C-alpha cells in the first residue's frame, strides 16, 4: 500500500505514468466508442468485486 | 489564476451574462405558478369556471351583479 505500511514504487517498475494517464484532452477520439464502453466497464471493478462477494449469500437465502 | 481567486468571479466582477439572472427569476416565477394554475384547473374541473364571482355561493339580490 502507498500508506504507512508500505511506500512508493521504484521507477524501474512503474507502469501507469501520470503524464500519459492524465491529460485526457481528446481521449474519446483516441479510444473510440468501443474503448469508451470498455473504460466504463473497467471503471466499475470495485462495484464488480463487491457483487461477486455479495450475491452468493443472497442466492442461498432465495 | 487571478480569474479563479473569487468564487463566481464573473458575477462578482460584474461581467456575468444577464441570462443567468433571468433564469433565476423565471424559475421563481414558475414556482409561483404551481399555486395559481392548479387553482384555476381545479375550480373549472369541479364547477366549470376558472374563478368564482364573489358571493356566488350565497343568495344574491335581484339586482346583484
Amino acid at each position: 500500500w502507498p500508506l504507512w505500511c508500505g511506500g512508493g514504487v521504484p521507477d524501474k517498475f512503474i507502469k501507469i505514468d501520470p503524464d500519459v494517464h492524465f491529460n485526457l484532452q481528446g481521449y474519446r477520439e483516441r479510444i473510440g466508442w468501443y474503448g469508451f464502453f470498455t473504460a466504463f466497464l473497467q471503471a466499475n471493478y470495485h462495484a464488480f468485486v463487491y457483487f461477486v462477494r455479495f450475491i452468493p449469500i443472497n442466492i442461498a437465502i432465495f | 489564476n487571478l480569474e479563479d481567486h473569487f468564487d463566481l468571479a464573473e458575477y462578482m466582477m460584474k461581467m456575468h451574462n444577464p441570462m443567468s439572472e433571468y433564469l433565476y427569476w423565471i424559475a421563481g416565477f414558475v414556482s409561483g405558478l404551481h399555486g395559481i394554475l392548479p387553482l384555476l384547473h381545479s375550480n373549472y374541473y369541479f364547477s366549470g369556471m376558472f374563478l368564482p364571482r364573489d358571493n356566488d355561493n350565497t343568495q344574491l339580490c335581484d339586482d346583484s351583479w
Binding site: L24, F36, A43 | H41
Partner: protein, 61 residues
C-alpha cells in the same frame, strides 16, 4: 518514491484519479440525462391522465 512526482493527488480530484476510466463513468451517466427526463415526464403524464385531469373542459362541454 520521489515526493514531488505525486502532485496529481491534490491537482486532480479523487473522483477522477482513474483517468479515462473515471471520466468515462461520469460521461456515460451524463448520456442518460434526457432519457431520464422523458421517463420522468411520462410518469407525470400517467398520473395526470389517471386522475381525469385532461377532461377538465370536456367534462363541462
Amino acid at each position: 518514491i520521489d515526493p514531488t512526482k505525486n502532485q496529481w493527488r491534490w491537482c486532480v480530484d479523487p473522483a477522477w484519479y482513474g483517468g479515462m476510466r473515471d471520466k468515462a463513468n461520469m460521461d456515460m451517466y451524463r448520456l442518460m440525462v434526457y432519457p431520464f427526463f422523458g421517463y420522468a415526464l411520462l410518469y407525470l403524464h400517467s398520473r395526470f391522465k389517471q386522475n381525469d385531469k385532461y377532461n377538465v373542459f370536456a367534462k363541462w362541454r
